[PDB]
């Protein structure tokens, strides 16, 4: 451990052993001076032309942390298309972390000329929040990641947290965190950090698309011995009077069998659709969308439960808030076009979860008698019955992966609306910070606090390791499947690939479900 | 404690002068919508039949029905099939042909009178029991699990 | 009791990378016609932003 | 009986995504007269049917 | 006996595949009147190799 | 045809390259890759020893 | 070393805590450049300094367009050894059998 | 392995053993940066006066 000497190696790698795969990736970090190291509260009121909905309280703090939860950070496009393959799940069991070739600078800067030169004393504070002290921030689709391409150099975030509020003053059951409370690890150049987590267990991701569906679970051969009730009303001419009549189901009357299962909840939505001429003219995006209304506020539910996006034939209709859309390269943050958003597409669970767009069924309303026609009533929001069946929502490319399940006392089906996994006890923060150094202090006493430093900033590597457990492919089906593929024939530039000036791009979203299994 | 769940059905009596004089059994039935299609809801939760001293009304669609021997198979009389009653889970569970509960509306003020609500189907909340659908001589035994991600109280 | 809420689950300094639909009519005028537009969550949007 | 099973559809046209399973890709032993077949089932746990 | 694959090769390969759209009858499977049949004579050479 | 030896497997390629350095970055953030970097080169000694 | 232009002076200055990045492929999953008479050896004299060429490669195309069969390959996707000043690098190789010159 | 000491030697020397032949040879090199750290696409056209 030394100044003329490195503390570490390049590790980008990635194995496989039949029912493991273990990936390793590294990049380049830079990190900045955030706040002059000041603690900041911020809020936002009511005042204005903001709206209640919109108003938060918090603090600001000059720490800077890691996300990569995320999926490209870790599979290259070849390995992704390697995994939805030939496997019908995948789960993780255990991490790394190591962060070495701290180097770090100070700037100077006098008339125009910028000079930056080498320190080799100053430190950096990094420590890890291994008991759930601190609020979680990551698992909520924040920017930030490790690039997806690996000869990139990125940027670390900085550290921010919300409260309880009442417009934009606080409350007394609100809290103030001070991250110089724990315990911390201060490395020099020629120092490293390094740790290791381990996954709980958790249910198999379900990588795969059934190719049956529930109406159509029965023999089409074979009549049923169970009957129903098929006639009201006589059919002699138009002298009709009241009867009873009863028949069994079969191969032609398949929609009247009776069935033992249900499929899954449902909450619906607003349809909207990608040709611009066969909409509403008019601004329906938040008047018409769909919320959930949480102490006098109107969040947005988004993406909503897991359900499917359309039906058949109908690609052109998605819901208005109840998929991920993902931007491409170079799209623009506010109001961007059509054709600078990708829409991806949850087709594969129509076999049992009801269409985001459409009612889920119809129950009756009254009491018929002689003298009154019966009623029928339209169920938009259906909860939770005895026997129903569903599927999560679909895992990508460029999505994230886990989610820290919220401490209460009670909870239902925990599997997060973004997709990927729940854990209860989630991979730690990690946090890092540059150390204050002092300018020159006056000759006289003075016990104000000081205020002139001098300005730093650091930069290194780090190495992120992470090891899945696989399940295999066993079926027994004849014809040829359904794979991911390339396009043959020609093009200007090779997709998944870099520019002619050096910009790499994903092209599109890579679903997981292309196998298939029976119900 | 709370009452289980409800999902609302149509009733019907076994008396055919008290029906409405309409074919009404695939227009005002129980429905779920799936991907462009309309699957019968057959028989759905597990929910009582009947409550006291109505023995004459079932629901449309969600009871077992069984048929007797050398029944028809198309358009059998009600004197040739036979209807099952769930009647032991009334302590518990709502009856198939009637509301959950009555929920609020609105804001009630000075000069505003309050409105109610009636509630047709409820999903589940913290706190229900309900008990499962009974089994019978000549019913099924077991039902294979689906294999997805999500699936609440798994009973057939 | 929490300090924290689940519509305030995020970053209030970071844009997302994730879009979502913005504008369907045009703002030139009267003259108005139909149109897509589409936007990144930040910190002045945070009730559009996408969620967990 | 007769066994046959359904796969996905768009009307009376199959997709992409549709199955084909052939049964004479199973092993399957062949028995002729005087020979016999048997095999042994666990059932894993499960609640108590109320009967009461 | 196999030899398995050990590039270094970035962009995404050209794999073997099927086709997504929809069709009157699944490719290399039965008539409707029990006739096998196959579609297309299959190539070998799709991976790649640096000379 | 330009003369020598005919070898499968031959010597393996030798590959060299200097690890870039960042210039001073924002004190905000920005998703975008950095593209300002210290002009750097570097030099040394090389010994290759081949038996006959 | 690092370089500073600042209005003509150019000054150069050492920097001890860069690193270089070497690594050798053994296992020939790289295109083969050697063995096509390129420019770039060690020089004939042996007091002569010289410069080290630029690596590129080619693939197959249709005019000034790739095709399906293309490939791209990522060099930063194999392992590699750091080294600061203080360090260094070897390896050692053994050729196979192969028919003598006939120089005669 | 530090700053202040060297880690080789100059060896460059040919011996002859009778029927074998062991040659040295050292050189120095310098490496400058390249593309400035950027992958890129570079291709030739029918177009202009170029042919096939």
Redesign the interface.
Not at 311 to 314: P, Q, R
């Given at each position: 451990d030394?100044?003329?000497?490195?503390s570490?190696?390049?590790?980008?790698?990635s194995t496989w052993l039949g029912d493991r795969v273990i990936t390793t990736s590294t990049r380049?970090w830079?990190l900045?001076?955030?706040n002059n190291h000041l603690y900041k509260q911020?809020s936002n009121g009511t005042s204005g032309g903001a709206t209640n909905?919109?108003t938060?309280f918090?603090y600001?703090t000059p720490w800077g942390y890691f996300d990569f939860n995320r999926f490209h950070c870790h599979f290259?496009?070849?390995d992704w298309?390697r995994l939805i393959n030939n496997n019908w799940g995948f789960r993780p069991k255990r991490l790394s972390f190591k962060l070495f070739?701290i180097?770090v600078k100070e700037?100077t800067q006098n008339e125009g000329?910028?000079t930056?030169a080498?320190n080799l004393t100053s430190t950096i504070q990094v420590f890890t929040d291994s008991e759930y002290q601190l609020?979680?921030?990551l698992?909520?689709?924040?920017?930030?990641c490790l690039?997806p391409?690996?000869?990139?150099?990125?940027?670390i975030?900085?550290?921010?947290?919300?409260?309880?509020n009442n417009g934009s003053q606080a409350v007394g059951?609100?809290?103030f965190y001070c991250l110089e409370y724990f315990p911390s690890q201060m490395l020099r150049?020629g120092n490293n950090f390094q740790f290791t987590y381990t996954f709980e267990d958790v249910?198999f991701?379900?990588s795969y698309?059934?190719?049956?569906?529930?109406?159509?679970?029965m023999?089409?051969?074979?009549?049923q011995?169970?009957?129903?009730?098929?006639?009201?009303?006589t059919t002699g001419g138009t002298a009709n009077?009241?009867?009873?009549?009863?028949?069994?189901g079969?191969p032609n009357t398949m929609?009247?069998?009776?069935?033992?299962?249900?499929?899954g909840?449902?909450y619906r939505q607003q349809r909207?659709s990608?040709t611009?001429?066969q909409?509403n003219?008019?601004?329906?995006?938040w008047t018409a969308g769909t919320k959930y209304h949480?102490n006098g506020?109107?969040?947005?539910a988004?993406?909503g439960i897991?359900m499917?996006t359309h039906?058949?034939?109908?690609e052109r209709f998605f819901p208005?808030?109840g998929i991920?859309?993902?931007?491409k390269q170079n799209?623009?943050?506010?109001?961007?076009?059509?054709s600078?958003?990708m829409l991806t597409s949850e087709e594969?669970i129509?076999?049992?979860?009801?269409?985001a767009t459409?009612?889920?069924?119809?129950?009756?309303?009254?009491?018929?008698?002689?003298n009154?026609?019966?009623?029928?009533?339209t169920?938009n929001?259906?909860?939770?019955?005895?026997?129903?069946?569903?599927?999560?929502r679909d895992v990508y490319l460029?999505g994230?992966i886990w989610?820290k399940i919220?401490h209460t006392d009670?909870n239902?089906?925990p599997?997060?609306?973004?997709g990927g996994f729940g854990l209860k006890h989630p991979p730690p923060q990690i946090l890092i910070k540059n150390t204050p150094v002092p300018a020159d202090p006056p000759t006289t006493f003075n016990q104000s606090k000081l205020n002139s430093f001098i300005t730093q900033?650091s930069?290194g590597q780090v190495s992120v390791e992470i090891e899945w457990e696989l399940q295999k492919e066993n079926s027994?089906?004849?014809?040829?499947?359904?794979?991911?593929?390339?396009?043959?024939?020609?093009?200007?530039?090779?997709?998944?690939?870099?520019?002619?000036?050096?910009v790499y791009s994903e092209p599109r979203p890579i679903g997981t479900r292309y196998l298939?299994?029976?119900?």
């Open positions: 030394g100044v003329g000497s490195s570490g190696n390049w590790h980008c790698d380049t830079a900045p001076t955030y911020i909905d919109n938060y918090g600001s290259s496009p070849r298309q070739n180097q700037v000329t910028k930056i080498n609020p979680y921030v698992g909520s689709a924040h920017q930030g690039p391409f690996p000869a990139d150099v990125f940027m975030p900085q550290y921010g947290y919300l409260t309880l059951r609100s809290s150049t249910p991701h379900s698309a059934h190719s049956q569906s529930l109406d159509r679970l023999n089409p051969l074979i009549d011995y169970l009957y129903y009730l098929s006639r009201t009303q009077t009241q009867t009873l009549g009863f028949s069994q079969g929609a009247n069998q009776a069935k033992n299962w249900l499929p909840p449902c909207v990608t611009t001429g909409n003219n008019s601004n329906f995006a949480l506020r109107n969040s947005l988004n993406p897991a499917a039906k058949d034939d109908e208005s808030n991920l859309i993902f931007g799209a623009a943050r506010d109001n961007a076009d059509y600078d958003v594969e129509k076999t049992t979860n009801p269409v459409e009612e889920y069924g119809i129950v009756a309303d009254n009491l018929q008698q002689q009154t026609a019966p009623q029928i009533g169920v929001s259906q909860g939770a019955l005895p026997g129903m069946v569903w599927q999560n460029q994230p989610a919220p009670g239902f089906h599997s997060p609306l973004m900033y930069t027994k089906r004849w014809n040829p499947e359904i794979q991911y593929t390339s396009n043959y024939y020609k093009s200007t530039s090779v997709d998944f690939a870099v520019n002619t000036e050096g298939t299994r029976n119900l």
